[PDB]
Design a protein around this ligand. Sequence first.
Ligand SMILES: O=C(O)c1ccc(O)c2ncccc12
Ligand SMILES: O=C(O)c1ccc(O)c2ncccc12
Ligand SMILES: [Fe+3]
Ligand SMILES: [Fe+3]
Lengths: 339, 339
Amino acid sequence: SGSGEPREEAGALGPAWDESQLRSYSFPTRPIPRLSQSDPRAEELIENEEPVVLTDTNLVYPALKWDLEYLQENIGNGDFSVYSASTHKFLYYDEKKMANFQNFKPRSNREEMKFHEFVEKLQDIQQRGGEERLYLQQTLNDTVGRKIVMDFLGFNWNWINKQQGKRGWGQLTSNLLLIGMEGNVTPAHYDEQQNFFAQIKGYKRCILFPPDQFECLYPYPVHHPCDRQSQVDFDNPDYERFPNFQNVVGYETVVGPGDVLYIPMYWWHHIESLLNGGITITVNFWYKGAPTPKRIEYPLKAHQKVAIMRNIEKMLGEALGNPQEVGPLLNTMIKGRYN
Amino acid sequence: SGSGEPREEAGALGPAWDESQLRSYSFPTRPIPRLSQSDPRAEELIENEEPVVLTDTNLVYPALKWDLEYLQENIGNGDFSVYSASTHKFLYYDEKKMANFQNFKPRSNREEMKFHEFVEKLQDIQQRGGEERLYLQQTLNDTVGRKIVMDFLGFNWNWINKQQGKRGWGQLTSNLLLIGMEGNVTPAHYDEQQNFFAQIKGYKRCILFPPDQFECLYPYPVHHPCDRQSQVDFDNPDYERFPNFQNVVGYETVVGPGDVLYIPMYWWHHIESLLNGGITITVNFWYKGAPTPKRIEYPLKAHQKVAIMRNIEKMLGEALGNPQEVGPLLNTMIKGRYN
Ligand SMILES: O=C(O)c1ccc(O)c2ncccc12
Ligand SMILES: O=C(O)c1ccc(O)c2ncccc12
Ligand SMILES: [Fe+3]
Ligand SMILES: [Fe+3]
C-alpha cells in the first residue's frame, strides 16, 4: 500500500499527515517496518542489510527542539552549503566530474552563506510568492554555536556506537544537517555508505529500492556528474528509453520527528518533504560499510555486482584515456556477441 | 580487385591458378603487396605491422621438395594431430573451454595417427569418392626422420632470426606443419602472435582483415570454445545478427610454393586451399609479439582495444564465478545507459 494509514499524533492532535501531501508515482510499494530499537526484528533487518524505521532510539533527542529561530540563534557564523532549484527536484552533481562531460549544464547551483542569510532568502520567497526552492545541506563541524555543541553531545552516541560495532562498519565518515522547504525532492539515487536518517522536524516520505533493481533504475554512467542517480524522471518516466522502470517495486515510509531510518548502503532512495508540510530538518549519519570478507562467497550479492560494474567503467575509462569512449567500446564488445 | 590476375609460372607452364578456383564472398578486397625481402617497403610493412608477401626469402627452401611420398618416407613414427570435418569449413575449438558451454557439440573432431595412416585415410576418400575432409596440423619436433631434420636445418634461420630481432619479437613459440585437402577452409579468426606463413606445396588464398574491423566480424565470446573466431558464416552471412559484416573490407592474396606471408598479430585471417588445386603444405612460424611499451601512448592501437575487451571478459567471468553470466551483466551495464 505504501506508507499505510497516517499515524495519529499523541494528545489527539490529529493525524500527522494525509495522503494528499504525498506525490503520485507509477510504481507500487511495500511498507518499511516501523519497530522499536529493542525489537529483535529491527536488529535482524539491520544485520541482513534491509531498511527499518526505529521509533525509539532517542538518537537526536536534544535536536527535536531545533527550528529556524533556534538555529539562526545558536548555529554560528560558519558557511552553509545551500542548493537551489527551479523545480521541486534537486539535481545534485559531482563538480569534479563536470570536466568529462562538456554539454552538461547545471540545473542545481550551490552557494555558501551564513545561516541568517539562508533564513532570509527563505523568507523572501515566502512573501514574494517565489518559485525558487532551497535546500541546506551542511556537515556539522566545530564552527557551530556552544548550545548546538551541547545538543550534538546529547545525541545517543551510546546506541549508534554499538550499532557501528555490531555491524562491523567503519568509522563515522560524516554528519549532515539537512533543512529543506516543503515539497523538496531528492531524486532516486544510491550511496556507498551505511546511513542512519535521523528525522528532527517535519515529515519526509522515503521510497527505497533494493540494489537488485539496478536494471530498472538506469543510473547515469559512472563518469557522469550525476553518477549514482537514476536517469528516470519519476514524474514523467520515459518507458521507451527505460522500459524496465515498469517493473520497479519500492519500499516506502514516512518518517517524522524522533524516527531513525536505516538506509543500507547501495540501496536506492528517493526522499521528499511532504507537500504543504512546512520545512523539514534531518541529520544523517554515514558510516563506511564493513570490510569485504576474504573468502568471496557465492552466490554474489547484488550490491557486489553493482560494485563490479562501477569498476569495469572506471578502469575502462582509465585504459582508454577518455570517459567519452567507454560507451562505444562496451557496445562494440557486446553487439552481436552478448545480446 | 582481390588476388589480381593469376601469376604466370616459369617455363611457360601456364597460369598458376584461375579465378574459378576461388570461392565467392559478399565482401570487397584490396591486394596484399608481393615484394622482395630486399625491398625497403616490405621491411616497412612488417615494421608497421601490416601484411606483406615476401617472394624470395628461401625461408623453407629445402622443404619445397616435400610431398606425401617423401614425408611418409622420412617423417618418422610420431603422432600427428589430424582434424576432420563434414564440410569444407574446419571448426576448431579450445577443448579446455568446452566445460563452460554445455550445449556445445563438436563439428570438427581431432585424432592422432601415424603419417602413413593419414596418407592412407586420405587415399580411401579419393577412390571412395568420400565427402569427409581432413587437415593435418602438427608441431615439428625431434621425433621426425633424419632427412627432415636436414631440411629443417636448411631453413633460412639467418633471415627469420634477424626479423625476430629487428621487430623486437619474443621467442619462436612454435612451428606448425599443415597439410590439407583441396577446398579446405580455415574460417576467419585472429591469433595473438606474429606469424610467418611459409607456403610449400599448392596454393592457398589468404584473406586478412585489420584489427579495427572487430565490430564487423563478431568474434565468439572469450570463454566460448571458438574464442577468437568469427561467428559470421562467410558462405551464408546472417546480416540480421551481424549487420556490420556488410561493411567489412579485406586484404587478400594467393600464396604459392616459396612465398612467405606475414600475418601480423591480431589481424583476422581466412585461409583456403584452392578448389581442385590438389593438396597443400604450409609451415607457420609463430613468435610472441614485442613487449608492451612502458609509456602507454595515445591514441590507442586497435589491437590494444581488442586486448582490453578480452580482459574485461576474462576478469568479469572470474569475478562472477561463471562465464555464463558475463553476457547478462554486460547488457545490464549498458542497457539504457550506454546505448
Ligand atoms: O535529501 C535528503 O534528505 C537526503 C537523504 C538521504 C541522502 O542520501 C541524501 N543524499 C543527498 C541529498 C539529500 C539526501
Ligand atoms: O589453415 C591454415 O593454413 C592456417 C593458417 C594460419 C593460421 O593461423 C591457422 N590457424 C589454425 C588453423 C589453420 C591455420
Ligand atoms: Fe545520498
Ligand atoms: Fe590461427
